[PDB]
Amino acid sequence: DFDDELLVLSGTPDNAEIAESIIAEVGDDPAVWLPIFLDRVKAERS
Amino acid sequence: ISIRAMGGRYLPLKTGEPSGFNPFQLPPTHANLIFLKQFVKKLAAAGG
Structure with a gap:
């Protein structure tokens, strides 16, 4: 499924305002923080 | 009337009465x- 990349590429101020939170908590590197951003996405997705 | 006849809760929401x-x-x-x-x-x- 491409939704794991849709919720990344698609424009959403709501999703961005928690992406910013998770990057603020861990801002090491996009190659590094991508799995945990997907993790928090799965955390809100229900 | 129907939803009551089918034996289920029907909430008749209206202004001025508590929401419930x-x-x-x-x-x-x-x-x-x-x-x-x-x-x-x-x-x-x-x-x-």
């Missing part, structure tokens, strides 16, 4: 916290 249902006793899981945060962020509209 409210989110006070909601479950506390993090997903439910997500929803309730979203709701209070949507209820707030009088705040421009």
Whole structure:
């Protein structure tokens, strides 16, 4: 499924305002923080 | 009349009478916290 990349590429101020939170908590590197951003996405997705 | 005849709850919402249902006793899981945060962020509209 491409939704794991849709919720990344698609424009959403709501999703961005928690992406910013998770990057603020861990801002090491996009190659590094991508799995945990997907993790928090799965955390809100229900 | 029909929904009562089918033996289920029908809530006749009307102005001036207490609502009867409210989110006070909601479950506390993090997903439910997500929803309730979203709701209070949507209820707030009088705040421009």
